[PDB]
Design an enzyme around this catalytic site. Structure first.
Site, PDB file in Angstrom:
ATOM      1  N   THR A   1       0.817  -1.243   0.000  1.00 17.25           N
ATOM      2  CA  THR A   1       0.000   0.000   0.000  1.00 17.25           C
ATOM      3  C   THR A   1       0.838   1.275   0.000  1.00 17.25           C
ATOM      4  OG1 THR A   1      -1.860  -1.022   1.197  1.00 17.25           O
ATOM      5  CG2 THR A   1      -1.701   1.397   1.238  1.00 17.25           C
ATOM      6  N   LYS A  33      -8.576   3.133  -0.948  1.00 15.81           N
ATOM      7  CA  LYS A  33      -7.888   3.405   0.305  1.00 15.81           C
ATOM      8  C   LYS A  33      -7.922   4.858   0.712  1.00 15.81           C
ATOM      9  CE  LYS A  33      -4.691  -0.315  -0.890  1.00 15.81           C
ATOM     10  NZ  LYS A  33      -3.259  -0.639  -1.091  1.00 15.81           N
ATOM     11  N   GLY A  45      -6.818   8.825   4.061  1.00 16.24           N
ATOM     12  CA  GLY A  45      -6.253   7.671   3.367  1.00 16.24           C
ATOM     13  C   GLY A  45      -5.602   6.771   4.407  1.00 16.24           C
ATOM     14  N   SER A 125       3.954   0.799   2.794  1.00 12.60           N
ATOM     15  CA  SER A 125       5.217   0.183   2.389  1.00 12.60           C
ATOM     16  C   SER A 125       5.860   0.985   1.263  1.00 12.60           C
ATOM     17  CB  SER A 125       4.979  -1.262   1.931  1.00 12.60           C
ATOM     18  OG  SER A 125       4.149  -1.314   0.778  1.00 12.60           O
ATOM     19  N   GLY A 157       4.514   2.638  -7.280  1.00 11.80           N
ATOM     20  CA  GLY A 157       3.954   1.361  -7.703  1.00 11.80           C
ATOM     21  C   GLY A 157       4.869   0.478  -8.522  1.00 11.80           C
ATOM     22  N   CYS A 160       7.478  -0.928  -5.395  1.00 15.72           N
ATOM     23  CA  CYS A 160       6.958  -1.777  -4.325  1.00 15.72           C
ATOM     24  C   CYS A 160       6.035  -2.857  -4.876  1.00 15.72           C
ATOM     25  CB  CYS A 160       6.202  -0.920  -3.310  1.00 15.72           C
ATOM     26  SG  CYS A 160       5.162  -1.854  -2.155  1.00 15.72           S
ATOM     27  N   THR A 163       2.162  -2.458  -4.085  1.00  8.30           N
ATOM     28  CA  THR A 163       1.535  -1.242  -4.576  1.00  8.30           C
ATOM     29  C   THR A 163       1.273  -1.383  -6.071  1.00  8.30           C
ATOM     30  OG1 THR A 163       2.763   0.076  -2.979  1.00  8.30           O
ATOM     31  CG2 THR A 163       1.800   1.224  -4.891  1.00  8.30           C
TER      32      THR A 163
HETATM   33 MG   LIG Z   1       3.833  -2.991  -7.791  1.00  9.08          MG
END
Ligand SMILES: [Mg+2]
Ligand SMILES: Nc1ncnc2c1ncn2[C@@H]1O[C@H](COP(=O)(O)OP(=O)(O)O)[C@@H](O)[C@H]1O
Ligand SMILES: Nc1ncnc2c1ncn2[C@@H]1O[C@H](COP(=O)(O)OP(=O)(O)O)[C@@H](O)[C@H]1O
Ligand SMILES: Nc1ncnc2c1ncn2[C@@H]1O[C@H](COP(=O)(O)OP(=O)(O)O)[C@@H](O)[C@H]1O
Ligand SMILES: [Mg+2]
Ligand SMILES: [Mg+2]
Ligand SMILES: [Mg+2]
Ligand SMILES: [Mg+2]
Ligand SMILES: [Mg+2]
Ligand SMILES: [Mg+2]
Ligand SMILES: [Mg+2]
Lengths: 173, 309, 309, 173, 309
Positions: A1, A33, A45, A125, A157, A160, A163
């Site tokens: 996230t 979220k 959020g 994260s 994104g 991670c 994400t």
């Molecule tokens: Mg990703």
């Protein structure tokens, strides 16, 4: 996230990804979220345990209601419930809340923290990944707060594994 | 024989500002007392009151309306706080006590109480299921259970004799900021047919509460000082600042509604109230400047970062 | 000498729609009052009432039946909520109080109370062992224990004198959605011989409750407005929409049974009830269109995904 | 354990294996992990601790009863019992519930989640195995929801050691 | 007809040192009793008291002011400790008891109590939400709820008859060292319009409390010894040391305010009080030396490092 918020030009934005993962497997990629509270006049959020996050969120909403919806005061009263003898169980989650006045991050352990100067917050994260892309974007660009958020989330994104690219961006006119 | 709904609203308009919906709703209720009673034996008993639920913020009129209404109808009246019955241990801490208290305030007039008694159950939203800090929830659900008998129709024993609650009008209230009316128990929910909403008060309304209503704060202080031989007069500008200040602190700190006007006036009439005896024959003009001086500057801080990291 | 079971049902049919089984069961019970009493000394005392358990949803008639029955038999009557005795601390919070309250409602007529008093113990399914959130379960088991004396036959002291409960008829009720009647304690279970089921109400039934029963809501409002010199009339189509709306919201939100009709009518007769005084001599026709306008559109949202991930 | 549900063509199915294992040894291979609730008008399948699963199931059933049997509302109220101060003990189990309207998965930690689009849910150790076979079957076949469930369960069973071939499939006409 | 605010302050000045603000505030309140009552039917009832909140440390005068005021106005008076109502179990442990107690202290004079009764609610800051050691907080919030009825205006039943609380003046107090007045509940907050601050007492004030006030400690001991035929006299220097010692121990140990003077005088008049009967005809001069001997040296230690590492 990943959740990040930028405040510039009298505009406040707060956005986040949509990936919900159980262990090393994804379960849903379209989660919201980031949501609106108090007659849709405050952005929130969350990140962390799916259940802990919602309970942190809910607990905060009850607060806004018991006050005139004042972000700061509310944050402080909620955090006060952890600073007593009755060891109010701790929640493994975090919240980013903002409105036309301030932006704060509240944790399930009982503390409130304010930005720094560039009015940028980020949790989860993937937080620090969107955080850098944003600091960078803010100290070297003229991009809208809404543009910075989407661009940084995307970046985060791509780094991670928890994400994804299914964003939900809310801004307060 | 009795006032009409349009007449009752006008009677209330002399003491209450705004809240048209709530005014309208209680006028209909009072008029129905008169409507039945014009009916014949069979129906006259079968037709019952349509109780009310007033949802609205602090100090915006919910009680004044109920109170004024009973006054204009010369009806035995009583106000109680829902929460007062949380836990019980003796006779007087039971819901049934609401009826004894009401009968006692009318000198035992049983026909009076039954025919048109009014009971205002304040803060009913407090006996619901709100927040997680719900220690004794069975307790709150419990008082809802205790009210049912009363609102559904029953008989309670008073030292004056037996009294039926079948036709007493019941008005409940709440802000319901966390709880909803749908949270009440089905039985209660169905017995509070009418739900009226009362709105917050703006500065513009504040300004009108200050002078328009019969025996307003401005009229009270004028008469109080006149007693000491002083003649006071509030200018339009003065009234406007008093209302802004009141609406201002209700907004930045704790919001207590129209009560704030009382707090501010007192802070304003501080000096004259003390020296009035030494100013006989004089006339005082409370204008903009007088108010800006008296009401100092911005309540007191706004600190709170002491707890923030 | 007294009505027969077939006659009693017809008397109840004038106020209650459906619920044939429950009607039938209480007619048999009332007729047995008359059957014994025609007996001789020995048996007349040995033969006792066959108490009832009415299982059924909210607001579908369980109390009206009990209430109407006592009315047609002019029998001292009393309704109490099983849960009201959860915990005790003073005289009035004890089960024995049910008998004093009953004796007090009949002006002390001891022969009356003993011969044909009726006690309706509402929500007895609440004092069982349901859900895990059972904090004080010994408490609920406890009130079951407290009722035994009464239902099994005993004497209680009232300020009017001693009164036996050997022949008082007892009617208990519940929805029993989580608990079953078999959950009650053996002693109680055996004292509630008869179990009748009452069903939910459909829109078709709603439509009939609106007009058929003596002093129905439509008949009440007709008479209320007639008081103000207004003549109102509900068309068949109008009644049908009022019933659909009522059945509709009980289904999508909280189901309160036939009480919902009261909520909807009030929301419908809102305007006329206020302007009736200004419309004397006129006649109002409440038809389909009038109802679709008055009853706006779909209650209010259906939100709930706010908590879902 | 493996439980999967597919909703297509106005048909809702929920099925699961029958293997009950204690450690690395099987105890029973004919367990019914899918059952009907609320007058047999709602399907429910469970996974996890044998005792925790039944208590999660039971707790949910009490809910349906206190409401008009509305799946969503019920799920939300049950989950609310975990989002308070009274730390309602958590259950190490999961439920898949469905009916003519919706399909949800509820966990013993306190959260409710909805499908995604293809209306497919799956829980248990073998879950994601049946999940893939089903997504595949749904985006490339015309097979009934009842056929997809049986076929995916079988597949899952041939991969997970805690998932056997003794299925129990329930569908809501 | 009655004293003016300037006159009342002078009457209080004879018994109280300092605390000008508190004195001023209660004079205004007492004068308003007289102001209304000079009004006509309509307003005379609509105008209500402006209750007070005295914030200030221990033993600095908050009660003496309230007590003296009632005395000079011959008004039924009563003091109660906010906390005394924490939990209840019987009639006498309910807030309503404040009014019965007040009516009982005036021999049932109902007109007296209603017109000008005064109620001093001590330590109201104790029923707030302070510290984490808040076990039964619902309890404290609860008594605030229980006071509302009284301060907002209601009727309580006493064995002497019914009594309204609409015009009784209410004075509350607190040190509010941890809690703030804003912590009270909105309803209460709005009913305590006036907030006056009372300050701590310095040695200079101590010295004046010793002699200036009517019936001061120095005047009391002079008259007490005169009874035994002894003539005593305090020198200016003596008074000054007694005050320094008092202010000294309140500062190094527990601070009890002006009460400390009583503790010190007693420790000082120890010897003469015993031998007075054997010293008839004599005259004693309490000077600096006499005081330094009598009041030994430095209270007792200051230990505390016994717990430190
Ligand atoms: Mg990703
Ligand atoms: N709309 C209004 N018009 C005139 N006075 C008002 C109004 N609303 C509140 N007040 C005043 O404010 C005070 C608080 O009244 P209250 O009825 O207890 O508000 P509520 O019922 O919401 O708690 C009263 O003294 C009343 O005269
Ligand atoms: N079957 C019915 N026929 C006519 N009126 C009914 C019927 N069922 C309920 N009502 C009405 O609905 C209201 C609720 O009645 P109630 O007896 O308390 O239902 P219950 O005993 O199940 O709680 C009553 O005012 C009653 O007139
Ligand atoms: N300012 C003062 N002037 C004269 N005497 C005082 C003063 N303050 C306190 N005292 C004395 O100290 C004692 C404590 O009085 P008290 O009114 O209970 O203080 P508080 O109301 O703060 O608790 C009383 O006997 C009183 O005579
Ligand atoms: Mg209020
Ligand atoms: Mg309130
Ligand atoms: Mg019922
Ligand atoms: Mg019920
Ligand atoms: Mg296998
Ligand atoms: Mg004190
Ligand atoms: Mg103290």
């Amino acid at each position: 996230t990943t959740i990040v918020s930028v405040r510039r030009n009298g505009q406040v934005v707060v956005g986040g990804d949509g990936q919900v993962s159980l262990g090393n497997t994804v379960m849903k990629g379209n989660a919201r979220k980031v949501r609106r509270l108090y007659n849709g006049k405050v952005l929130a959020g969350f990140a962390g345990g799916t259940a802990d996050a919602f309970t942190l969120f809910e607990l905060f909403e009850r607060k806004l209601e018991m006050h005139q919806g004042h972000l700061l005061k509310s944050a402080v009263e909620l955090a006060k419930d952890w600073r007593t003898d009755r060891a109010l169980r701790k929640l493994e989650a975090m919240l980013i809340v903002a409105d036309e006045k301030e932006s704060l991050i509240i944790t399930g352990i009982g503390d409130v923290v304010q930005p720094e100067e560039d009015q940028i917050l980020a949790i989860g994260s993937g937080g620090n990944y969107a955080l850098s892309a944003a600091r960078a974007l803010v100290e070297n660009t003229e991009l809208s707060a809404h543009e910075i958020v989407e661009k940084s989330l995307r970046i985060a994104g791509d780094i991670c594994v928890f994400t994804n690219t299914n964003f939900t961006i809310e801004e307060l006119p | 024989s009795e006032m009409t709904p349009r007449e009752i609203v006008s009677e209330l308009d002399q003491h209450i500002i705004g809240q048209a919906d709530a005014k309208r709703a209680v006028a209909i209720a009072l008029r129905n007392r008169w409507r039945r009673m014009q009916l014949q034996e069979p129906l006259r008993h079968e037709v019952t009151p349509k109780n009310i639920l007033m949802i609205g913020p602090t100090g915006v009129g919910k009680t004044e309306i109920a109170r004024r209404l009973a006054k204009l109808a010369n009806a035995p009246f009583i106000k109680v706080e829902a929460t007062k019955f949380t836990e019980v241990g003796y006779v007087g801490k039971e819901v049934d006590s609401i009826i004894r208290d009401l009968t006692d305030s009318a000198g035992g007039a049983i026909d009076a109480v039954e025919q048109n008694g009014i009971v205002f159950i304040d803060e009913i939203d407090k006996i619901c299921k709100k927040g997680e800090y719900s220690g004794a929830d069975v307790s709150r659900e419990g008082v809802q259970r205790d009210l049912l008998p009363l609102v559904e129709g029953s008989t309670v024993s008073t030292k004056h004799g037996m009294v039926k609650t079948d036709h007493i009008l019941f008005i409940a209230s709440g802000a319901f900021q966390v709880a909803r009316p749908s949270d009440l128990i089905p039985e209660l929910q169905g017995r509070l047919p009418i739900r009226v909403e009362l709105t917050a008060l703006s500065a513009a309304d504040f300004e009108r509460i200050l002078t328009e209503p019969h025996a307003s704060l401005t009229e009270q202080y004028k008469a109080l000082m006149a007693t000491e031989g002083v003649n006071i007069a509030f200018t339009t500008d003065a009234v406007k600042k008093i209302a802004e200040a009141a609406f201002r602190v209700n907004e930045k700190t704790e919001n207590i509604g129209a009560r704030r006007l009382h707090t501010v006036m007192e802070r304003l009439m501080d000096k004259i109230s003390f020296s009035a005896s030494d100013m006989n024959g004089q006339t005082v003009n409370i204008d903009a400047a007088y108010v800006a001086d008296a009401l100092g500057e911005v309540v007191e801080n706004e600190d709170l970062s002491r707890f923030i990291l």
